[PDB]
Design an enzyme around this catalytic site. Structure first.
Site, short mmCIF file in Angstrom:
data_model
loop_
_atom_site.label_atom_id
_atom_site.label_comp_id
_atom_site.label_asym_id
_atom_site.label_seq_id
_atom_site.Cartn_x
_atom_site.Cartn_y
_atom_site.Cartn_z
N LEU A 1 -4.26 -84.85 -5.54
CA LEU A 1 -3.76 -86.04 -5.00
C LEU A 1 -4.97 -86.79 -4.34
O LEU A 1 -4.76 -87.33 -3.01
CB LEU A 1 -2.79 -85.71 -3.81
CG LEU A 1 -1.12 -86.44 -4.05
CD1 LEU A 1 -0.24 -85.90 -2.87
CD2 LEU A 1 -1.44 -88.17 -4.00
N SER B 1 1.64 -84.44 -14.75
CA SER B 1 2.55 -83.35 -14.40
C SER B 1 3.83 -83.70 -13.73
O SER B 1 4.16 -85.04 -13.39
CB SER B 1 2.05 -82.91 -12.94
OG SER B 1 0.62 -82.64 -13.44
N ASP C 1 3.83 -75.37 -15.14
CA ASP C 1 3.16 -74.71 -14.05
C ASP C 1 4.12 -73.70 -13.41
O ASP C 1 5.15 -74.21 -12.84
CB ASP C 1 3.15 -75.89 -12.94
CG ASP C 1 2.13 -75.41 -11.76
OD1 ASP C 1 1.87 -74.27 -11.54
OD2 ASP C 1 1.60 -76.42 -10.93
N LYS D 1 -10.66 -77.14 -10.49
CA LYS D 1 -10.82 -77.87 -9.26
C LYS D 1 -12.18 -77.83 -8.57
O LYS D 1 -12.38 -76.78 -8.25
CB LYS D 1 -9.67 -77.55 -8.35
CG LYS D 1 -8.00 -78.40 -9.00
CD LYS D 1 -7.10 -77.70 -8.08
CE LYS D 1 -5.79 -78.14 -8.52
NZ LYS D 1 -4.54 -77.39 -8.43
N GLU E 1 0.52 -71.83 -16.38
CA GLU E 1 -0.41 -71.97 -15.31
C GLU E 1 0.18 -70.93 -14.28
O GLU E 1 1.14 -71.13 -13.62
CB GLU E 1 -0.61 -73.23 -14.75
CG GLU E 1 -1.78 -73.61 -13.85
CD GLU E 1 -1.99 -74.83 -13.31
OE1 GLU E 1 -1.38 -75.96 -13.90
OE2 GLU E 1 -2.35 -74.88 -12.24
N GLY F 1 -5.95 -81.57 -10.28
CA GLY F 1 -5.96 -82.69 -9.36
C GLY F 1 -5.44 -82.31 -8.01
O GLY F 1 -4.93 -81.27 -7.96
N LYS G 1 3.01 -81.70 -18.38
CA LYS G 1 3.10 -80.37 -17.80
C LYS G 1 4.21 -80.31 -16.96
O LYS G 1 4.75 -81.29 -16.42
CB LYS G 1 1.80 -80.36 -16.81
CG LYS G 1 1.80 -79.10 -15.82
CD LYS G 1 1.03 -79.29 -14.57
CE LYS G 1 -0.32 -79.97 -14.87
NZ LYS G 1 -1.12 -80.57 -13.76
N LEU G 2 4.97 -79.33 -17.26
CA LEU G 2 6.41 -78.89 -16.41
C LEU G 2 6.30 -78.15 -15.45
O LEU G 2 5.86 -76.95 -15.62
CB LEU G 2 7.59 -78.79 -17.33
CG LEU G 2 7.82 -79.73 -18.47
CD1 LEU G 2 8.82 -79.15 -19.59
CD2 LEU G 2 8.17 -81.02 -17.96
N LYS G 3 6.66 -78.26 -14.18
CA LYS G 3 6.77 -77.23 -13.28
C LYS G 3 8.14 -76.51 -13.57
O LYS G 3 9.01 -77.07 -13.72
CB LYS G 3 7.24 -77.97 -11.79
CG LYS G 3 7.23 -76.91 -10.64
CD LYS G 3 7.20 -77.59 -9.45
CE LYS G 3 7.51 -76.61 -8.51
NZ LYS G 3 7.57 -77.23 -6.77
N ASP H 1 -5.59 -71.02 -11.70
CA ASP H 1 -5.77 -71.86 -10.79
C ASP H 1 -6.49 -71.54 -9.59
O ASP H 1 -7.64 -71.25 -9.47
CB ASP H 1 -4.40 -72.72 -10.47
CG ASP H 1 -4.84 -73.95 -9.70
OD1 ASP H 1 -3.75 -74.70 -9.21
OD2 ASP H 1 -5.78 -74.31 -9.16
#
Lengths: 360, 370, 360, 370
Positions: free
Chosen positions: C284, C127, C180, C254, C205, C282, C153-155, C230
């Site tokens: 963290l 990401s 995202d 998740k 997303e 994920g 994945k790009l924000k 999500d």
């Protein structure tokens, strides 16, 4: 605590434009203060169904005799005291909005604060009529982009829609750009309006009939540009129906059109519950009307610039003591209780065509 | 004009109940009352939290809510100045969920703000009823008939709606016996989200006993299954747990998941958002009614003031405080006669903490400052 | 056979990032083994509704007293012993996932094997946050394409979405590319997101509100890029409703968000029954959490790369003895019973902010 | 850890029935039982095939299934090592249809795997009921009243649901007489896919006799007509034949073709896929119940273990083995009292082949090796 409406004045003014404009005012007196509101119906029924003559009849014949000498808990109680009558939302808005002004003033509280807003400033846009050709449209847009206006609205009409919009977007790839289709279209024209989609307009305003939701909902399925409803949303339930039918994605909210501040907050809240924005429409108001609009605009679902630009654009001299001037596309909320503005009684006298006072 | 929130007390109290409240999610015999008191401008605002010790009716807990108040909401508002309650609400960042926790802050702010103006809370919200119609919800019954006797008792007091808490394996019987003895009252069932789409047959013939609505028959967080069940039965559905915001209300009504909403002020995040829920429902032609959470007189009085708005068109759960408490936490009695509850008089809630009595039922108490 | 939960430890760790991160752990002891699980709720409710403080209350006040000293047939029995409580899926996931770990270990079987997976390796993606401009985005994408990551994945956010995506696709015509939208959008923005369709993103997303399905379903009708849900899929029935309303075509799965491994396999199976893929989200995680995710990812409807990249990307040093390092975009399943990883108790001690043990 | 499938026996047996089972597709008086035994790691897994000698209930045959086992499935797994039953299933290539044939391999593998771990089959699948509610399905009747007497007999044994096999020209009568004498039982009809949308009137007034569902009224392979019929009647529909996979279940429920599913483990291709069907149904709020195919104790025991999952919310067809067989193929009795069937104890199915007795009813037997 509560409030007694002791007296009411109707003042009809002939206010010179920057060819005059007739401005009906209602002043409600009580508890040592006054509330003032401005009628936005026309001499003849052109924008909608109501007229000045018909509204004043209702005021002095029905609405005023119903409230004069009564005591009220809030402005909602005042509106309720007239609930058995149908339509005439702009006539009713005169009583309702003056009552908000009055109520807010017996409290010492700014009107927008009472409605639940907390912006100190509101973004404004500018509307542009039909111009002679493409570059005259672009030149006038360029002028307004430079003054800091935060949205540009073009009037369009069949045979003059894609051209001004293409020219503008080309010159101004990134500005917020909208059009007013002024009910000039039919479902037959859906292909001509599909052609606007590549220019990323924020919305197209009321392309089809002024009283329609069903056909708009149908047109919305044929084009990608969001539709904005104006004349066809006269209430919270109109708003609810419009958004639920998919007749539009944005609402042009005019406070007198829906019956005043309380219904307007309802429309604002219904729209928001659908995640649709509102924005503040205009009707060439004097400072009374302009001040009411600005206070309503401070509500948080007003996420698109509104037509509450500078009074100096419209009048040589306004009916109020306070200048309402936008700077860099931002209009400050006039300070003070209620609307935060004050009639200039000596100047208004000079432009009064008729006035009357009703008591108890 | 504007107000400065100078300080805040959190006070947690416990009150013995008077009846035993059995619901589909369990029985309750005492009630823990978390209060938040906001202080500013020489007055104060008081609000009652409606979250439970454990997440039984919905997702929040007293423990979770308090540390959110301590570590986040309070620090965000203490020593700050606001124009109105909406600005206070705005300052509580973009934190997700936790509506009842937010409601404690938001509703205390509405009480404080109104008191600074010297206006009744309900008046500021736009209501102008001087009294409000109320019914009673009656817990789950020992037997198929101890139901009707607890009913008669209430029909005789003029309560304007009778509500029967029901449950899997105890639903058609308690209603059967009730509609047997009282054939013409406004009657309804709760049904504490204890069912599924499966049980649609079981709930179908309740259609018979002419109930005004069936309240939350399916999952507490569902709208879509409810929409489907609404199409498989004649009795209108009422949503409680499912509606935690004005957009929730909008979706529920757009989907046809219910035709009635139980509006709980703290569940939706407070007065402003309750006013939006109310307005959205109105706009669909759907009425609301004021739900209850066995509140002390602080909460009950916030409820009564919200209920003065004009779309509260059905009787609420706001019955007489003496049904619940030997002694309430406020000085004023909140009593209904003939199914009408008068609006307690005064600025804000129009009620007052009995600090002396509260002290003897307090079990936790903090003071936070600017 | 069956298993008795004898004891439970809560350990709260302050683990330094590669500014620390608080890591709550639950350890369940029984039958001579232990199961370990990691809480993914935050200090404050930012990604969703739950907090560490509120979850630990529930654990030590309700969930733990309900299971301590009881005997259980499988982890589903353990979850059931807490079914009367609403929401709090992440709190519940701590008990549920530790129980899977525990159960799998009394059996000598890897966790993924028990859930019905049989991949020995799982594809991973990376990401990317918002960068300063287009070429800084492309430079960072180029780096990650070269490391072998199998999805990028790009924000994005309004005003910064088409530009980074256009730049990237232009440089990288063929890679799997996703964005995202981080709930930063409204239905008003559908035209801005329609503009992403020509860049063939695998999905967008959660563009609209975190708790919404209905508006997503509406947005899905206005754009061609599949939507990925999500935060709004907290259960099997959420998954079922999302896919049936057409709110999305892909689910970000998740494990703690939906209440643990068993519900997750349900979501995975519901999605699959609609021929929609899942992929492993994920949060963290430390190696405990990272190891649980990898084992769940071995299930066959995980057909898009997951956010279970190398631990070294996130930590100076992990709480576990085993390194979890992706190579060329593939993450090996850690060998061993249960999660196949082991707490480093001496290192964890050095970063423990609080711990407690509850018995029988 | 991992398992190696070292060898396989196919054993075909025949058992005299005890009652005569008349269905819309014919009468049955004996039953052929194809068994597959998988061997590895010093234990074995046993599964029973539910395909018929001729394709009457559905499309597969014993003959077709066996050569598929011989020439394809077995060669693909013999001498191979697998992590779990899903890996075994995965190794049976992309061959289309033939779910029951696959189920013999898949279910034998689940029994073998569990036995290697020493855990009950149901436990591995996530179930934790120690017993399961059961009803009975009763074949087609000689007369309009020999129906009620076979019924009484069963209501008296505490069976939790009564199911009447029905047929074109024999449907409203048998139910009429039954609901006449037993007005309050859970009652349902099968209807063996013998009808069409035409007969919607005939099936409409069955709405009256308050059935929990009508099972497979239309074509065995249909979903869409069923959806339409569901809209023309009040009684929920139950799907059997139509649902051969979890995506079938998803489509059926998304379309509204039924609100209930009869889950037959071998029809859908085995335990894993049955667990997916179960989970998908749950996610729609639709219950399942365990159907039966007159199984020997091998099949009946696989059924009982699957039925321990929590969405098996209605009584299944898993009644007492002594209703069917003078002597079963396993050592343990599978008997229900009061409509509850206890889960046979032990690893895997918790039941054991009586090799000595089986030998005397065997008519075919092969051994295949790595």
């Amino acid at each position: 605590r509560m409030f007694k409406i002791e007296a009411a004045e109707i003042v009809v003014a002939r206010l010179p434009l920057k060819t005059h404009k007739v401005v009906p005012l209602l002043i409600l007196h009580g508890e040592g203060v006054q509330g003032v509101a401005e009628g936005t119906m026309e001499a003849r029924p052109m924008y909608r169904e109501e007229t000045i003559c018909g509204a004043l009849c209702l005021l002095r014949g029905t609405f005023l005799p119903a409230i004069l000498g009564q005591t009220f808990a809030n402005p909602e109680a005042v509106s309720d005291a007239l609930g058995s009558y149908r339509g005439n939302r702009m006539a009713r808005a005169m009583v309702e909005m003056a009552a908000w002004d009055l109520w807010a003033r017996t409290l010492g509280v700014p009107l927008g604060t009472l409605l639940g807003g907390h912006k100190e400033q509101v973004e404004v846009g500018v509307s542009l009529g039909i111009q002679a050709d493409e570059q005259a449209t672009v030149d006038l847009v360029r002028r307004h982009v430079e003054q800091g206006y935060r949205r540009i609205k073009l009037k369009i009409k069949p045979g003059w829609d894609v051209q001004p919009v293409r020219a503008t977007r080309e010159a101004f790839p990134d500005i917020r750009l909208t059009v007013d289709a002024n009910s000039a279209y039919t479902l037959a024209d859906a292909g001509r309006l599909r052609q606007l989609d590549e220019y990323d307009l924020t919305y197209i305003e009321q392309p089809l009939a002024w009283d329609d939701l069903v056909d708009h909902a149908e047109l919305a399925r044929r084009i990608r540009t969001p539709l904005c409803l104006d004349e066809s949303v006269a209430s919270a339930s109109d708003a609810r129906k419009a958004l639920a039918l998919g007749a539009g994605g944005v609402i042009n909210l005019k406070v007198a059109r829906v019956g005043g501040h309380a219904e307007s907050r309802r429309v604002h809240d219904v729209a928001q519950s659908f995640g649709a924005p509102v924005w503040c429409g205009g009707m060439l108001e004097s400072g009374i009307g302009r001040a009411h609009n600005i206070h309503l605009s401070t509500l948080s679902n007003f996420r698109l610039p509104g037509d509450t630009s500078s009074a100096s654009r419209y009048w040589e001299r306004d009916l109020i003591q306070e200048p309402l001037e936008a700077v860099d596309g931002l209009m400050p909320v006039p300070q003070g209780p209620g609307t935060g503005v004050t009639l200039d009684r000596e100047f208004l006298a000079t432009v009064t065509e008729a006035q009357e006072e009703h008591r108890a």
